DNA sequence: GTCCGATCAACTGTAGTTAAGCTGGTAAGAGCCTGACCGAGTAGTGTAGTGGGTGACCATACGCGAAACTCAGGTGCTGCAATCT
């Protein structure tokens, strides 16, 4: 049901991998504030290459835009509903 | 271009103006090398940006193997009937 409510599909058939789904859960927790890709990377505990390669699987669910943070160039992520 | 021949001075006869250096004590040209002052020269440097190639991580593909699932093989008794008696 959590899978279905967030992705629109059940765990039994959804195309999103477990790691990418946990990324989505972090964006779900942050809601209206959303998460920048580096704080997401730090909180999930994985590197920016891995985060970027995974985020492709969910870019249709997320509104995004560029921003500059701690001298690095990053994007903000928000679920469409927020 | 050349022709005539007048004519400043070329090259030719003797009558009269120019240094060099001596006695010195001396300031005058022409000068030398260290030093200082700015302009220019030798040239590697200081940020800043374009491109490229390495590295990691992924997924996509086949191909071999592993277990799954479907459908039909195979076991063994005995309910019922028929051969030998």
Swiss-Prot record:
Disulfide bonds: none annotated. It comes from the Eukaryota. It is found in: Nucleus; Mitochondrion. Component of the TFIIIC complex composed of TFC1, TFC3, TFC4, TFC6, TFC7 and TFC8. The subunits are organized in two globular domains, tauA and tauB, connected by a proteolysis-sensitive and flexible linker. Interacts with TFC1, TFC4 and TFC6. Present with 125 molecules/cell in log phase SD medium. TFIIIC mediates tRNA and 5S RNA gene activation by binding to intragenic promoter elements. Upstream of the transcription start site, TFIIIC assembles the initiation complex TFIIIB-TFIIIC-tDNA, which is sufficient for RNA polymerase III recruitment and function. Part of the tauB domain of TFIIIC that binds boxB DNA promoter sites of tRNA and similar genes. TFC3 is essential for cell viability. Cooperates with TFC6 in DNA binding. This is Transcription factor tau 138 kDa subunit. It comes from Saccharomyces cerevisiae (strain ATCC 204508 / S288c).
């Amino acid at each position: 049901s959590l899978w279905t409510l967030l992705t629109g599909y059940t765990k039994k058939e959804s195309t999103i991998g477990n790691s990418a789904f946990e990324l989505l859960l972090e964006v779900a927790k942050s809601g209206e504030k959303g998460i920048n890709t580096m704080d997401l990377a730090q909180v999930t505990g994985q590197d920016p290459r891995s985060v970027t390669g995974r985020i492709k699987k969910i870019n249709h669910l997320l509104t995004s835009s560029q921003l500059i943070y701690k001298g690095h160039v990053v994007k903000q992520l928000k679920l469409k509903k927020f």
